[PDB]
């Protein structure tokens, strides 16, 4: 067919033209995850596929599904990592290094993993603030 | 002389997400979910995936998640499966009209059991998230 090149320009960052499938993909967030719905030209036609993609974008905007989910714990140095799906806690090891530990949400439970991370960070913070190195003992004389 | 044949039998399909390969090369599922198909343009083969989901009503507005789609790489196949998937195991979702009755009886007892018998009591569903 004959089509102007401006057809493939999208007016919103969440609306993308996918040329392999020749479809308009609309991104959104559902159930604390990212999803994309395609609108194919083979289904709707040239102009109608884009029109329906824009209408679905407006629907998701009204539903509030364009907002980025956020995971926070309120404790500095403890944050959720998507790549490993784990709660990461950062502290200082015995060697005086900066080290981290990751507790798996799939295994422990999301909140269980968060709690384990926070408690481990607190324990290591206590040990570090103590100040004693390896194989060290504190004695007070008066 | 496979390359000269034309019948659809000779050309096998390929495993994808949550799918294994059997001894005789059967493609079998590995998780509770819903079937999806994909077309690999690079290899020109069909790929069988299973999107993990708990049992619930299959709605008209959700049928687009199981469309057959074209991909170039298995990495893109996994990406598409993630994008169409409904929810993740660690967060779950609000089930829409999930089943509540026990499953169908074993085949050797009765081949024609009834699905979701209202006369039977509600029993917990604690196997379809695995």
């Amino acid at each position: 067919v004959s089509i102007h090149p401006s057809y493939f320009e999208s007016p919103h960052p969440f609306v993308i033209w996918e040329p392999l499938n020749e479809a308009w993909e609309v991104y959104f967030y559902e159930n604390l995850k990212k999803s994309a719905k395609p609108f194919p030209v083979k289904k709707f036609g040239i102009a109608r596929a884009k029109r329906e993609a824009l209408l679905f974008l407006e629907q998701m905007k009204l539903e509030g599904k364009l907002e980025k989910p956020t995971f926070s714990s309120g404790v500095d140095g403890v944050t959720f990592d998507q790549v490993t799906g784990s709660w990461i806690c950062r502290f200082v090891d015995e060697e005086g290094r900066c080290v981290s530990r990751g507790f798996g949400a799939d295994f422990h439970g999301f909140e269980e993993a968060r709690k384990l991370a926070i408690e481990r960070q607190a324990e290591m913070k206590k040990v570090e603030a103590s100040g004693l190195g390896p194989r060290m003992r504190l004695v007070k004389e008066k | 002389n496979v390359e000269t044949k034309r019948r659809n039998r000779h050309f096998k399909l390929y495993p994808g997400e949550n799918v294994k390969v059997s001894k005789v090369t059967n493609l079998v599922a590995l998780c509770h979910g819903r079937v999806k198909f994909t077309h690999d343009v690079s290899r020109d083969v069909l790929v069988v995936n299973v999107l993990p989901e708990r049992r619930e009503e299959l709605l008209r507005e959700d049928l687009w998640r199981y469309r057959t789609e074209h991909v170039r790489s298995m990495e893109e196949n996994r990406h598409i499966c993630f994008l169409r998937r409904k929810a993740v195991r660690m967060f779950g979702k609000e089930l829409v009209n999930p089943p509540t009755k026990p499953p169908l009886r074993p085949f050797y007892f009765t081949k024609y059991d009834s699905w979701e018998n209202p006369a039977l009591p509600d029993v917990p569903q604690l196997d379809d998230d695995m």
Binding site: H108, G109, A113 | -
Partner: peptide, 13 residues
């Protein structure tokens, strides 16, 4: 909100 339980919480402890 409530969260689904992990694999650990399903073993016969």
């Amino acid at each position: 909100r409530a969260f689904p339980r992990g694999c650990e919480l399903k073993d016969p402890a």
